[PDB]
Amino acid sequence: LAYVCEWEKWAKSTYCPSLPLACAWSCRNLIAFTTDLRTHMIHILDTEHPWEVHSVSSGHSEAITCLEWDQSGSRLLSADADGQIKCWSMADHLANSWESSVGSQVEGDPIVALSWLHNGVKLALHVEKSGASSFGEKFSRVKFSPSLTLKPMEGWIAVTVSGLVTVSLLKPSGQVLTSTESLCRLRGRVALADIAFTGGGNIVVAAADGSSASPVKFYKVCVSVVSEKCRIDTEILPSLFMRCTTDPNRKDRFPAITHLKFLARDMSEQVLLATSSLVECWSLRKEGLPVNNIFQQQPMILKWRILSATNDLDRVSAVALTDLKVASDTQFYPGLGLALAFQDGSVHMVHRLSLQTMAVFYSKAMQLSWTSLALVGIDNHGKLSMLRISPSLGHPLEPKLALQHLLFLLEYCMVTGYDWWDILLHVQPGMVQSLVERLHEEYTRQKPALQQVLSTRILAMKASLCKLSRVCDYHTKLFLMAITSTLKSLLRPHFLNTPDKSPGDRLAEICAKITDVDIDKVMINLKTEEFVLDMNTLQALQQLLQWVGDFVLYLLVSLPNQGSPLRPGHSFLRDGTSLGMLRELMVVIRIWGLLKPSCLPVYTATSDDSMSLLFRLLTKLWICCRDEGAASPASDGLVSRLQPKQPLRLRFGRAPTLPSSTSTLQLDGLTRAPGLHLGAYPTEECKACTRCGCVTMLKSPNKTTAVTQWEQRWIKNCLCGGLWRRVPLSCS
Amino acid sequence: AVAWLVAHVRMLGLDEREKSLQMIRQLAGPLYSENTLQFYNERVVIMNSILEHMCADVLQQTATQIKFPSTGVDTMPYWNLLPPKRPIKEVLTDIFAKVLEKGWVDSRSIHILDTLLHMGGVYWFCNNLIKELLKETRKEHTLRAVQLLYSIFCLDMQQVTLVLLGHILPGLLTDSSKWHSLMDPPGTALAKLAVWCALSSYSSHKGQASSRQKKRHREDIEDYVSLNMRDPLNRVLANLFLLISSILGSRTAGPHTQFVQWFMEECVGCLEQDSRGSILQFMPFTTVSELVKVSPKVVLAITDLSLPLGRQVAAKAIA
Amino acid sequence: PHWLLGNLVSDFVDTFRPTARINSICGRCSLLPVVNSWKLDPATLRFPLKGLLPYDKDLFEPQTALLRYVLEQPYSRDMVCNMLGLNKQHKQRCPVLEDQLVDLVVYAMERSETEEKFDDGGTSQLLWQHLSSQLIFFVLFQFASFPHMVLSLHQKLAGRGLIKGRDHLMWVLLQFISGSIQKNALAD
Amino acid sequence: VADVVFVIEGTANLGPYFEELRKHYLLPAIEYFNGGPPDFGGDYGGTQYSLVVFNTVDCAPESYVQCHAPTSSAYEFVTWLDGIKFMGGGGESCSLIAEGLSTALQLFDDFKKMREQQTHRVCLLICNSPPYLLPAVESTTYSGCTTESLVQKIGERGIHFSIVSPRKLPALRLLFEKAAPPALLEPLQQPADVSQD
């Protein structure tokens, strides 16, 4: 329906018959796109600005299975497992660089990719409804046995699909071998799917051939015994099978997926699978056996029970799936929703246990992207690009409940620190405006104290809400607020001064209690000597700090623009508190320039100290707007004078978006259709220039000698820095 | 009792009541206790023992070994014999090298091979086989190898040949990475292999085995675009021949020109009936015209039934 | 051989295969019973001299069985010296030979692993110790890239042969290092 | 005997400074328990210690602790973690690691299960940025606060604990002396390596 790509030169590869495909990411950057071009390379693509598609050559054949673990970029490269797991961590998130972290499964073919790190978060959404719980009961975490802790470590241990015993030789971040050999029941044959995270620190696996027989090689295995050894268990869990063969009519089902979910108590995805469609579901409800009929008159045993089964019409399954045991009456979001695309055109997305019907709007392998119902188009139609359908959470309309669910999932994404893509699900930003208003209100009132660690993130979140449209004002305003706050905050504790009664930054913070003008007075009024750190500080003022100077300049000219066709115009910046923070920055950079002549002046004229008059006008407007002040006093008329010193042409970092409203968005693989400030930005490109999409637009090596503070401080993900991209320069 | 013990072994083995039950049942308990008017207790007990031996294999494997209630002479030696603490990547260096150095197929080991067949996948089976094949670097050894290999492909002819013709030939011809292998004189054997398996498959073949008929239910359309019937083997052969004709195209031929040359050469054979060559808008005629530039070999192949279609290729072969 | 060339060369080797068979003798099982230009003397994992085209690599693959059998036998020092050695004091080069004793190290664990020496059923350990002593008598090229011995430790992890081998392994390591302690440095 | 613990956290806040501190405070400290860092056998020799350096929640939404340093023979992995610790850590400057030191306490716990047959347990933690946060562990059962962490490190076990920060001094040393057992946070001095910090 919407969000479809295409590949110009490549096609369905009519020469090769076919190849099984797979991909799955529960975190950001969830595109892997196993395919065959016209063995083949593996692709990675982000959710925003998918124009810059990337790929990288593999080193094996048939690329059968891959599934990441955490936000840390990684992949599996199964199917004889050549070039095993690693990170990217080179300059950005657009190059594989598979390191020496390789596990040599000699000439095998497993289909297992699992062993995550920690517990699944608990969500009492229906009960709590996030009224005033303050993330206490609304978002919790159930105690869960960490797999082979020592601090939770983790490895890529899997199960031999081709083989029949086990995987060994684990070397997680220790470069140690630890080689052994185990028997593992001395017999087996499997074509199973893995289900790892169970109650104890064990792994579960069961399937052999299909509906023909009824074998399940349940292997309850234990790995944590002692360092430099392995004792893999061979505990055979109680077997089971697909009761579909009970029909005396026919038995041709032959399942081929039988996948599970991370909750190993309440699902069994057996299904009749050319010329058939019949889902099945069983549980692990422990119960005693009817020991009777032996005469006139350990009960603990496990015998599976049915959950759900019916006749359907479908060919391909995608993925199985909050917590259960909740009367989800008022809940209509995809809570534990299991959907799968239907071959015959439209996609009948419907939750479990009903399967009846939903809205359709008449006249290979997939996985669920996230809570927002936007699937990936890898259905049984050949080498076709991705698709998306309506994420409508339920039949009826409920704006109140809608925004409630939206804020619930937003706060969940905030506390879990994952990516957010509920963009397509929300209506135009007016409702989103009310939502963010209510959100910041609840944040301020019932934080209660997590604010001091949760503020920055949600500000960036705000950006997303203000990203789509007419309301581009809050976007730029929040970007400047965030960058200024961050830079000033990091500049504060960078003083190797001599100790005093209180901290240097803390004592500088109280500068609010000072007169209006003549900063040269207040600076010596508080302290002058203990502010110099070292001679090698002549790299920040003339190069990067100049920004803030120009910044305040850009305020002046933008002050008398209330009559413009934009209520805040470019920005308003009438908060006062942030303004006071900037004024503190001004006085500290003033004493800095007093300590070194390489500061940032007006650069134009009237030097015989423009900075002084600039600062006094800023303090004037501040005190005129600190505690519920007026806006446009008579002083506004005089400060509105344009002194011959203001420069222009500033970055004001921003990015495009995906305005796919309702109908269709068709793009190619390339050639998109329309619709750190340490210098490092000339007219034409001059280096590799590894940039980012949020605001960054910076250089890769930073081309410096001792300014490593900022560079090292921003080597990793920047402010919402998942969009650290790269692109070479043009050539004639 | 044995059958239901085999049914109940699917538990956690924490009770193991049926194990001791079967052990008691297999004992010498009935030593003329009741008025057993049989007079054949000896042979009956021998049959009971041999039947208990043939079944209960999984129970005598998944649990502790029995206390040897056999007291026989020599039980069935044929078994899995798969080294537990060893991967499946052993067939080549343990079987193929020996059988090439030996003079016969080592019938016993064949049983093992059978277990190897319906255990993994035919795809990777034939893949690793042909991979281990190209190492002799001498025509005689490659000849003996493919000779033994045509035989080892028996008991699974239909599906194995289908998977081969579908993947293993495009798996090298389609790309240039695997082209390196095709240049070898083993390539001639590979061509002989291909034509032999194609001939055997196209020929009448029932192939009805228990472990095969019980495991001969899948789904596959092969996505064989057509741009005298609808049979998987025939369709796969048509797609294969179309790809041969395509590879016979110009602008690049280092290793594969010799491959298609050897293919066409070995295809020439008396008493054969393959290469039907549909004559509506297909390549085989232009293919023969081009192969003539590499004399009367194709002049005999293309002559399907002396139809007026064959007049064209005849005139072209006139030269 | 060259790809774009014809099979004209390949078959030319095959028609050349039988005459070279007229120059073969046997499977080269073993010829070294004595303890005294010569038979069974390879230079670098290859004895033959004719530059013709013999049969499969059975005569090209190193005769590991031969050196394995001769080394485990006592008094082999003179035999190995005359068969592959040259200027034992004027040509120290530390050849590939060490890999051989690596197997002799692995085989070592086997002696302790195989039924756990049948729970000390006999005195094969005595012959083992004697052979190890003889090998230590030839400790002049043993630690060519000394970390190679660590490789022998890696294979020692196979089956976790630290049940009873460790004692004799440390013992023979002592027997070796005792004659070379003051010679080399602690770095090795 | 000599059960020490080495902790640093200012990697996110200030990296290069640590490299300077290593030249004067970190490296000489290790020489108090070894004849010189080279490559030796490692076992339960009492004098072993750990090396724990992590980051904050700024740009790590999937990782908090990955420590692994049981014995390390005090030379190899010690020097490795010293020179190859990290270069990341962005966001802002409000708090880097407090929840880390709590996990540090947990480390002492395993000593009770490992150092059986006292040992005058000692510990040292470094952090440039002044830390403060609401969460406690998010990794294990134990939970508390900075106050709970210090009272555990002092009263629950007489582990001598100091913090050799950069030459600057934040508002941290004050509260860290509220323990009735002597905390001995004195070893923050340009003078040479103290005997036992």
UniProtKB/Swiss-Prot annotation, chain A:
<feature type="repeat" description="WD 4">
    <location>
        <begin position="561"/>
        <end position="602"/>
    </location>
</feature>
<dbReference type="Pfam" id="PF11635">
    <property type="entry name" value="Med16_N"/>
</dbReference>
<keyword id="KW-0677">Repeat</keyword>
<dbReference type="GO" id="GO:0045893">
    <property type="term" value="P:positive regulation of DNA-templated transcription"/>
</dbReference>
<keyword id="KW-0539">Nucleus</keyword>
<feature type="repeat" description="WD 5">
    <location>
        <begin position="681"/>
        <end position="720"/>
    </location>
</feature>
<dbReference type="GO" id="GO:0005654">
    <property type="term" value="C:nucleoplasm"/>
</dbReference>
<keyword id="KW-0804">Transcription</keyword>
<feature type="repeat" description="WD 3">
    <location>
        <begin position="252"/>
        <end position="292"/>
    </location>
</feature>
<feature type="repeat" description="WD 2">
    <location>
        <begin position="187"/>
        <end position="229"/>
    </location>
</feature>
<dbReference type="InterPro" id="IPR015943">
    <property type="entry name" value="WD40/YVTN_repeat-like_dom_sf"/>
</dbReference>
<dbReference type="GO" id="GO:0003713">
    <property type="term" value="F:transcription coactivator activity"/>
</dbReference>
From Swiss-Prot, chain B:
<comment type="similarity">
    <text>Belongs to the Mediator complex subunit 24 family.</text>
</comment>
<comment type="subunit">
    <text>Component of the Mediator complex, which is composed of MED1, MED4, MED6, MED7, MED8, MED9, MED10, MED11, MED12, MED13, MED13L, MED14, MED15, MED16, MED17, MED18, MED19, MED20, MED21, MED22, MED23, MED24, MED25, MED26, MED27, MED29, MED30, MED31, CCNC, CDK8 and CDC2L6/CDK11. The MED12, MED13, CCNC and CDK8 subunits form a distinct module termed the CDK8 module. Mediator containing the CDK8 module is less active than Mediator lacking this module in supporting transcriptional activation.</text>
</comment>
<comment type="function">
    <text>Component of the Mediator complex, a coactivator involved in the regulated transcription of nearly all RNA polymerase II-dependent genes. Mediator functions as a bridge to convey information from gene-specific regulatory proteins to the basal RNA polymerase II transcription machinery. Mediator is recruited to promoters by direct interactions with regulatory proteins and serves as a scaffold for the assembly of a functional preinitiation complex with RNA polymerase II and the general transcription factors. Required for basal and activator-dependent transcription.</text>
</comment>
<protein>
    <recommendedName>
        <fullName>Mediator of RNA polymerase II transcription subunit 24</fullName>
    </recommendedName>
</protein>
<feature type="short sequence motif" description="LXXLL motif 5">
    <location>
        <begin position="169"/>
        <end position="173"/>
    </location>
</feature>
UniProtKB/Swiss-Prot annotation, chain C:
<comment type="similarity">
    <text>Belongs to the Mediator complex subunit 23 family.</text>
</comment>
<comment type="subunit">
    <text>Component of the Mediator complex, which is composed of MED1, MED4, MED6, MED7, MED8, MED9, MED10, MED11, MED12, MED13, MED13L, MED14, MED15, MED16, MED17, MED18, MED19, MED20, MED21, MED22, MED23, MED24, MED25, MED26, MED27, MED29, MED30, MED31, CCNC, CDK8 and CDC2L6/CDK11. The MED12, MED13, CCNC and CDK8 subunits form a distinct module termed the CDK8 module. Mediator containing the CDK8 module is less active than Mediator lacking this module in supporting transcriptional activation.</text>
</comment>
<comment type="function">
    <text>Component of the Mediator complex, a coactivator involved in the regulated transcription of nearly all RNA polymerase II-dependent genes. Mediator functions as a bridge to convey information from gene-specific regulatory proteins to the basal RNA polymerase II transcription machinery. Mediator is recruited to promoters by direct interactions with regulatory proteins and serves as a scaffold for the assembly of a functional pre-initiation complex with RNA polymerase II and the general transcription factors.</text>
</comment>
<protein>
    <recommendedName>
        <fullName>Mediator of RNA polymerase II transcription subunit 23</fullName>
    </recommendedName>
</protein>
From Swiss-Prot, chain D:
<feature type="region of interest" description="Interaction with the Mediator complex">
    <location>
        <begin position="1"/>
        <end position="197"/>
    </location>
</feature>
<protein>
    <recommendedName>
        <fullName>Mediator of RNA polymerase II transcription subunit 25</fullName>
    </recommendedName>
</protein>
<comment type="similarity">
    <text>Belongs to the Mediator complex subunit 25 family.</text>
</comment>
<comment type="subunit">
    <text>Component of the Mediator complex, which is composed of MED1, MED4, MED6, MED7, MED8, MED9, MED10, MED11, MED12, MED13, MED13L, MED14, MED15, MED16, MED17, MED18, MED19, MED20, MED21, MED22, MED23, MED24, MED25, MED26, MED27, MED29, MED30, MED31, CCNC, CDK8 and CDC2L6/CDK11. The MED12, MED13, CCNC and CDK8 subunits form a distinct module termed the CDK8 module. Mediator containing the CDK8 module is less active than Mediator lacking this module in supporting transcriptional activation.</text>
</comment>
<comment type="function">
    <text>Component of the Mediator complex, a coactivator involved in the regulated transcription of nearly all RNA polymerase II-dependent genes. Mediator functions as a bridge to convey information from gene-specific regulatory proteins to the basal RNA polymerase II transcription machinery. Mediator is recruited to promoters by direct interactions with regulatory proteins and serves as a scaffold for the assembly of a functional preinitiation complex with RNA polymerase II and the general transcription factors. Required for RARA/RXRA-mediated transcription.</text>
</comment>
